[PDB]
Amino acid sequence: STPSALGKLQDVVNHNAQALNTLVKQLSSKFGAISSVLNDILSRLDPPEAEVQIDRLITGRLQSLQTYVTQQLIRAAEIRASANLAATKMSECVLGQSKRVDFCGKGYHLMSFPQSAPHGVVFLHVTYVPAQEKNFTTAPAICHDGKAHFPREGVFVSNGTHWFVTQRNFYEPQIITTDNTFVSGNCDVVIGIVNNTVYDPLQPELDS
Amino acid sequence: TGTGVLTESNKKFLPFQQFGRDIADTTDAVRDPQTLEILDITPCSFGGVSVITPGTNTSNQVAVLYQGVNCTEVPVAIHADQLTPTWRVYSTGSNVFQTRAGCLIGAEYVNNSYECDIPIGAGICASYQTQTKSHGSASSVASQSIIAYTMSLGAENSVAYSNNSIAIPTNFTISVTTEILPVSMTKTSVDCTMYIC
Amino acid sequence: YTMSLGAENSVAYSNNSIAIPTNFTISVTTEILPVSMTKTSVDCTMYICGDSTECSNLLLQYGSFCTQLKRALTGIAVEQDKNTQEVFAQVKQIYKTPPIKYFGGFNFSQILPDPSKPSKRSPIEDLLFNKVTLADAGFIKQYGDCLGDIAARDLICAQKFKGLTVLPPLLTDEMIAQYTSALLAGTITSGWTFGAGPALQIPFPMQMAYRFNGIGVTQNVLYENQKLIANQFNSAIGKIQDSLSSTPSALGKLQDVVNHNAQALNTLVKQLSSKFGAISSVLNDILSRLDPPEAEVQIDRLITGRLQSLQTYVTQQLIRAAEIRASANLAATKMSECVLGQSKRVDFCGKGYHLMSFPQSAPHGVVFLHVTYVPAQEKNFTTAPAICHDGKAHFPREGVFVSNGTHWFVTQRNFYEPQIITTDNTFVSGNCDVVIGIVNNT
Amino acid sequence: CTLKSFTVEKGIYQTSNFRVQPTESIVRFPNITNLCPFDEVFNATRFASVYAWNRKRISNCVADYSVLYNFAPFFAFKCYGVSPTKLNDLCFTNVYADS
Ligand SMILES: *[C@@H]1O[C@H](CO)[C@@H](O)[C@H](O)[C@H]1NC(C)=O
Ligand SMILES: *[C@@H]1O[C@H](CO)[C@@H](O)[C@H](O)[C@H]1NC(C)=O
Ligand SMILES: *[C@@H]1O[C@H](CO)[C@@H](O)[C@H](O)[C@H]1NC(C)=O
Ligand SMILES: *[C@@H]1O[C@H](CO)[C@@H](O)[C@H](O)[C@H]1NC(C)=O
Ligand SMILES: *[C@@H]1O[C@H](CO)[C@@H](O)[C@H](O)[C@H]1NC(C)=O
Ligand SMILES: *[C@@H]1O[C@H](CO)[C@@H](O)[C@H](O)[C@H]1NC(C)=O
Ligand SMILES: *[C@@H]1O[C@H](CO)[C@@H](O)[C@H](O)[C@H]1NC(C)=O
Ligand SMILES: *[C@@H]1O[C@H](CO)[C@@H](O)[C@H](O)[C@H]1NC(C)=O
């Protein structure tokens, strides 16, 4: 439906086509020559006299071809930058998972599927994008037994009455034990430190 | 020789010096030859012209932006006379807005801000906005529906920063975006004699 | 003299010699990325031909070079706007900084917007604005050509006189500054979470703990010496201001970009005075001296020369625009991975382990204040590749085995902090036979 | 016409350049007076003989051919190589008003 969805590849194809059409029109430009047809120039003036005119036309056409080739080199350098980009996207997005931010699609890139298209590739960047965020009160550490605890993997949040360590990119509360937090220092230096309780998984086994 | 505006100069010309030149060899300052006064040479107001339009299948009305010039003193002479309000001495009314980019004629300014559709220049963005302010036909407002407005850089969110407040996202979407990478332009070969000769 | 390749240090290699850094510095380095050269438009008739009608008529007969050049320049200009949008407009919403600008001591005042001065640019942004030579902004002075003056700095006036037109950026210097404000506000407030969708508030000490954890440095360091980090950060910002203002080589990259643009334009202007083999270099004088039937050859030669000069200008603009676009893709990558996140690519967001990054808009570019972690004050120790215990070789989970000289400690690999060796930091794999250099311990 | 189409799409398209033509002509030269001797020669106390025609050096001054008129009517005003009235637009290294 939307014609601009394939804007980049269609633009590349149109750039190729318009460069070719410009080349074709260069056979129509006079470039200061008496005309723009080789046969007419040859048939009108003798080679001793037509030499200047045909040289002028040759210079014009050759300069146009040189501009075409140089701009082809420039846009081929751009194509090769995008092609090394595509090779890296195949290697790190398709042949693997890339942790470079916003490299294989907005959000956290999950995986990519190559889809060949005329003179290019389409990456269906399957990415993970969160939504519906809930607000909580947080704390940079947890003071227990007079010593600090920092989360191994998650972040401390609180629904208002209870503190939970959660994964930093998907709301999933979990209770706090020693397996998710580690001790570092004491509760005299750190600002924002809050008193809480941190569970010991070994406790029930102390029944006997 | 020169073409431009001669204005009174605040700079005193040396008893023998002839006419001002700038760093890049330009006839910019001047001293009156006939009598002992000094002038400055100003380039004429020529800028450019650009056409802001929605889809042709959607509308046939238009707006015209003159880049660089300022609405206040711009000599908008008779460019092209037709049924449209543009390219005349003046527009049909208040739809003449002055931005740093230039003079927007045919589009009405809006104090409200929306997302940028057609970048005009210097932060102002245009849109063919169908409104009932004229209270006329649904698909065609009475005047030209092209309006300009300060580009809303987005919803002016206020991340509620607090020394203890955080946000964690409860839900997610497995988005499938689509990135198009050109890989190989059509390989081409030019027989030099066949093309040139 | 022969070049001193540096202090010829003798790395004290041994089978068991290692150095662990006990100290560090918060190096607020500075990387200046050109992002968008000034967008430009060349009125083919006004530049090549000026106001001469006969020249325009002859140029039309020549072909469509003007159309191709104008399309190329328009592509460059929309590419510059795209560069700004990709680099700066990395988020939809715009975030206002909270009124209580307290963040544990990290004095962002020189980088946060200044409510006192009307420009609302940060003081560091003000320094970067002053140090870099300025540019036209289309001031409303009722001069006919926006800005202008009498017998003053009229080089921009001269450029507008000659037909080259510097179109304004789509996002104004104030609007580019507000986009930069939004980015910096999100970075300070939301953290890295606003580049993945919605912005999620998080205090700056917690974001800095994440930045520590992302370079293999345990995040407790950021809180045990939080005040030291804050003071080093603020003093480094002050030294940044002092170096930028005093040392004139500080803003070399962007000033060189601006100078390249200016000298390209100046060379363009001087091409008008170049003869290229023509009897003169002024079209009006040629026309007034010789009628078109005989002035045709001279005006044609001058047209060809100026067209070649313009084409070379456009091609070198395309080359340097590909350079600016490579640096702008680098800047977008550095904002995504350094600003909108933490990049662990080595020496990508500044020398040392990159902590975090702050964008600061500068004329036609961005200054990244690459806050990095750099170790110092290393101590020597005798090390082992494993530790034999009960006939099985224990290997460190996350750290490295070093020895004071009489005690063995498993320490973090980039900050000296001895810890006793237990089963939680070490794991068993194999037996004490194939491990050469294995060391008895407990 | 610019897009070579009949269904142009939404957007802004650079069409042409806005120009303001000049409306007045200002030709000015710095008020030089420098009276050439023409009238003083023609009404002198005594002229010079024709065979010994006096070679009057006419240079460093500005010519005022408009006063060559208002003499006796139907006086011969022949000119060879250049028109008498166009002399105002010509410059000369030297002029001889031999009388
Ligand atoms: C937290 O717990 C410590 C002992 O673990 C106690 O001394 C202190 O009063 C409690 N409250 C605060 C605010 O530190
Ligand atoms: C907070 O979470 C605890 C966990 O069980 C729950 O019992 C409590 O009702 C929750 N309170 C609020 C206000 O969400
Ligand atoms: C955070 O809360 C207020 C407002 O931001 C601030 O002034 C204060 O210094 C901070 N207090 C704590 C306990 O973090
Ligand atoms: C998460 O969001 C999806 C919408 O994509 C919704 O269908 C689903 O029910 C949500 N999950 C929960 C647990 O509410
Ligand atoms: C230790 O010193 C050197 C370097 O490895 C080597 O020649 C020597 O044999 C080593 N000996 C042992 C026991 O590792
Ligand atoms: C670590 O280095 C900083 C350098 O800024 C120094 O001030 C600090 O005292 C050092 N730490 C120790 C424990 O000496
Ligand atoms: C180390 O421990 C082993 C037993 O696992 C013992 O045989 C050996 O003598 C000890 N010392 C050395 C240097 O290997
Ligand atoms: C090394 O550190 C340990 C830690 O307690 C200490 O007992 C020992 O004396 C130290 N030895 C040296 C040589 O520093």
Author numbering:
A (entry chain B): 940 to 1147
B (entry chain B): 547 to 743
C (entry chain C): 695 to 1136
D (entry chain B): 301 to 399
Share the article's original sentences.
It consists of 2 functional subunits: S1 and S2. The S1 subunit includes the N-terminal domain (NTD) and the receptor-binding domain (RBD). The primary function of the S1 subunit is to attach to the key receptor, angiotensin-converting enzyme 2 (ACE2), on host cells.
To do this, we performed cryo-EM structure analysis of O5C2 in complex with the S protein of BQ.1. Importantly, the ACE2 binding interface was completely covered within the O5C2 epitope. O5C2 corresponded to the class I neutralizing antibody against SARS-CoV-2 according to the structure-based classification. Although the O5C2 epitope included some variations among the Omicron variants, namely D405N (present only in BA.2 and BQ.1), F486P (present only in BQ.1), and Q493R (present only in BA.1 and BA.2), these mutations are located on the periphery of the epitope and could be tolerated by O5C2 according to the BLI competition assay.
